[model samples]
Target chain A: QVTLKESGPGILQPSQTLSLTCSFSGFSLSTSGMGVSWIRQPSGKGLEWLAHIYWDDDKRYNPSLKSRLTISKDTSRNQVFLKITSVDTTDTATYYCTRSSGSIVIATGFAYWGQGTLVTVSAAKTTAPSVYPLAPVCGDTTGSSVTLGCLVKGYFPEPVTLTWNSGSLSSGVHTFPAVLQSDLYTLSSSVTVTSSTWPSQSITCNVAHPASSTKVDKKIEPRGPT
Target chain B: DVMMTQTPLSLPVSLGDQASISCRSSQSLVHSNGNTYLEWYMQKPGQSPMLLIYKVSNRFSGVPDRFSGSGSGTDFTLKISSVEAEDLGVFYCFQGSRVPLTFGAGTKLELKRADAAPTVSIFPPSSEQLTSGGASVVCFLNNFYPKDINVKWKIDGSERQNGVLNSWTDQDSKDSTYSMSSTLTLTKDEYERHNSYTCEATHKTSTSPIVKSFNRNEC
Candidate 1:
């Protein structure tokens, strides 16, 4: 079974910042797009979800952390880290790292997680937070009678997924062509879909790596008089 | 598929400076929800990013309109029309509507200290009508800065499509920022009674606001 462990400053002085790293065993944080999340348990209160770090490019957080928490990685050590600023009585908590399988999108909620780590918010120990990369763009356009094109950006070398949902088709997933240019990669895939008012429909395009947390589904409204 | 690269023109944006981020997805993010689930984010110097927008065009809970998102499926863009003093940090994007969630390279949003008067703007500036199904309204913010932003929708006062928001960000260039455009679908009743809907954009540094409203009749 894949496991994720947490390590960091165990104790904190008043007004000190809290820093911690999550170490993993049995699984590569860079292979699967899903796995690993960080949660905080206050000294005596309920659990607080800080953020989720995935092997792929997807990282998420509780709305409250948008301004106070940071999550990043140290590829050399095969570990992920979390940093929270402005330690106060309010920020004191026991932080635990956990793991999850499946996409942050469809899997719904997190299932696996790390044991909680404890830290007290204080002063002078604060450091700037590390930011995760952004999401990729998924583009789609209509070509001939029933064809569509899709595209994505900002993904490294990895397998990506492309899907089509037209209410009547059964084929679930399809793969297409991808091209690497400069530091960016471009790929395309296509599928034949049923058209309710027209003859047939098709949408194709390549995407970046599958590790990206950004997934898209677009439908070009039927074309008009040409 | 088309490959679009977003290289931010500047970094550490200043207050009131517009920030832009581009999204080049391998595939279209259009989903059965009737809207695409493409989103943007802001990671302050140290913090977990927030959900700026989701389903491709809706704002998150309590975001401002100055943070606008536009663009079609593949080559999409997020713009912050006007930058604010508190809008300092990094930005990213995520596509959560599909499998194996994906994200973009981030653009750092910094503050440029300049002696200028603070400014504000209106959100969900416009509205459109829907037939029998639902009405999809696009909230547009013309000028913004520091590009780290989020977009979401509210019916009456309650939040709809709670899971529609995906967390992510993007870095396009300096000097110019991107905005996110969110689409909100209103049931016939929710659409009629709730004359005013809001599009909120939250920033990392500035005291950016939440809930830019769009009156139904404002069409």
Candidate 2:
């Protein structure tokens, strides 16, 4: 019947620190049989292990985030704390505090989970979008088809729209949603066109972010002869 | 990290039947301390997940005798003998032999019903205001035998393909039957235009599909 509750800020500004607490009841945190850990999941992504702190003071963290993550506990108060320094948009995820039994390495899986708190990172100033062209592929025997790609990087406040333009060469376009990288969002889009139509035409990738009225464009020129 | 992978994403078993799930880890789960740190868990619907087996082949205390765990090194298996109605849910394999423990993407256990059908209930929009963009309608099916069931949505008698459907078979620790639920999300337009939304379930236990309709006017 033990329960764990996570309490933290719902929103944070970029570069700010994050502090979360996991309070428990019905079970004592000082018990020798259990350990606590911090786990987080990006809005639509899978879970990521942040750090684990044992009742005995042993701790381990995901190497990628080890430098900025710290986990501590208060035996008397029966609570655990998680702190992340210089947090960014990528740190904006639902954090869950969990408890497990046995030693850190030999402990059981998370037996109890905190309800999880969603943290959003936002700012008033908009960052300019940057776009880069990927090498076009033209290997068709008939030389009738080619594929062009564009990489849009460094934008904030997602829901960015990407459009493809190549006049008659624009057959179809596929765009992937923005992925958080560090503090900004990056996305990619590809366009497939008939090589004969745009033998030398430049394919343009237009990326528009609602935060910014101006759209950023990157152009890719066909490599091989038609 | 000992990576764990589960196969056959979903499993359907009938009462009195035996079911088994396999979990493979990237590295040996055997720790330097001479113990295999592999464990199994079952996460029933809306309930906290509980451990079923620990230390490789040892069953957790109070776990049913029908459940067993066996394996070695990197290959582990969890077997259920004489599957009961209360055994349906997601099964997870975890490796605790290494730092930064890892878990297998869960494998779901579904009930296989040869008799008895599900009772359907509908939960309409929670908000009375229709302008909330859209409403989520949850179709709950309870007390079904044999975990195999499919729920479909139809707006005004016409099948609607765009709604999201989530199905799970769960059993309370004390229950002898499995219960399931499915939910469908509808846009504001679809909710207002269609007076009736039907939730149809097809299962092996029932010769004819079970259909439950919710009228908007009734809401």
Candidate 3:
């Protein structure tokens, strides 16, 4: 029956301090057997374990963020607080507050999670798009067909165009629509090629932002199961 | 910190069948207090993970008898007997005996299609305690399948239903089978009567009722 909610500023300036609060009910911050933790996921990305505080006030943080992060609790109010200094656009993510139950060793995973609060860190009044390439993945071969995927992530101002190119193949490129990631967007496109046409040809991914007239290219050598 | 690893990332089981998943920790999970802090959880699709086993062998309240846990220290196992369609899900093992709790990557239990009654062993009150104010008799049922057996007590050929009775089932990690035990308490007057007490088990798989009898003279 425990419930948790996260609250924080929607917008933050670069290099400015960021503060967030987690208020809870059906459990006591001081007496409950469970602990509270702060976790974040970059929009459209994987999870990051930020910090945790046990009911006894024992706290720990992700080594990467420890120097810039501070986590504390207010027992009287049944709330926990998080503060980060020198925030940057990369810090813009959805922050979640979760509950962990166990003793001595915390529970392996969280049981209860709060609806995350999106935080944006930017200096520009109107943030421009930033395009980046993710490592490509080549799927296993099934018969003569192989699937190749190119991941293009971290772009603001949505509606980016993505295209795939390789030695001419019968199949057309399939690009997925942009997926929103907290003031930014990410999209991925994949292409399928027959094993006979893969060796001598290299797969390439091209991305462009129409609004900014910016383009980026990423290529991968085909090395299927050999 | 105890690192945990589970094998065979995925398992395929048929209805009425059995399955076993193993979890290995970098270090022993046994605490100095004589309790093992290894726990198991099941996360069905679209549902929050539920606690299945805690402290290694104890099933959490409301958990079905089909799921059981075993193993001490570094090696632990979770076995499901008579797998049901609803049992298909990802299973995780958590080590709660150390700092910075950790979990296994999770083993997925997948559903496919299709699958002892128990052997009863009665232990009469021990000799050292036969003279005590009261005595208790224990019945152990082992090598069972399906985990849906019930135990009843009969004193002097008459059924007795009004005593403290408790039963719990455990799964064998190697075979995915189950073992269970039930205990019945008796008063001093009943113990002194030198009556014959029989423990009977009822199950769908039993061709006939399974029974084991205990006598005060045997103690």
**Candidate number with greatest TM-score:** 2
Q: Is candidate 1 or candidate 2 better by lDDT?
A: 2
Q: Summarize candidate 1's per-residue lDDT along B1-219 as a digit string, tens digits.
A: 112234472466556767777777777767765566666755443233455765556666566898888877787777887888556665666665554444565665555432221121222211122333334343433234545455656656665664232212232234343333343434555556666566665655356565556455544
Question: What TM-score would every model get versus the actual structure?
Answer: 0.30, 0.52, 0.47
DockQ of each: 0.02, 0.06, 0.03
TM-score of 2: 0.52
Interface RMSD of each: 20.0, 19.2, 26.9
Q: DockQ score of candidate 2?
A: 0.06
Between which residue pairs do clashes occur in model 3?
B15-B114, B16-B115
TM-score of 1: 0.30
Candidate 1 lDDT, tens digit per residue, A1-226?
A: 6556777775566556677888877666666555566766543233345676666646676665667678787655768888877666566566777655444343223334555555644332322111111111121224332322233322443335554453343342223333333333333333334334223333323222334454454443332211
Best by DockQ: 2
Q: What part of the reference interface contacts, as a 0 to 1 fraction, does candidate 1 reproduce? A: 0.00
Clashing pairs in 2: B111-B146, B111-B147, B112-B146, B112-B147, B113-B145, B113-B146
Off by over 4 Å in 3: A7-20, A32-34, A38-50, A60-69, A84-96, A100-226, B44-50, B84-86, B111-219
**Per-residue C-alpha lDDT of model 3 across residues B1-219, encoded as one tens digit per residue:** 457889767776767888899999998877777977788877654344566888788887678999988898778889888898778778888775665556687887764321156655555553333444556665656656665678888888988887535434333444555556565667667776856878898877756899877555433
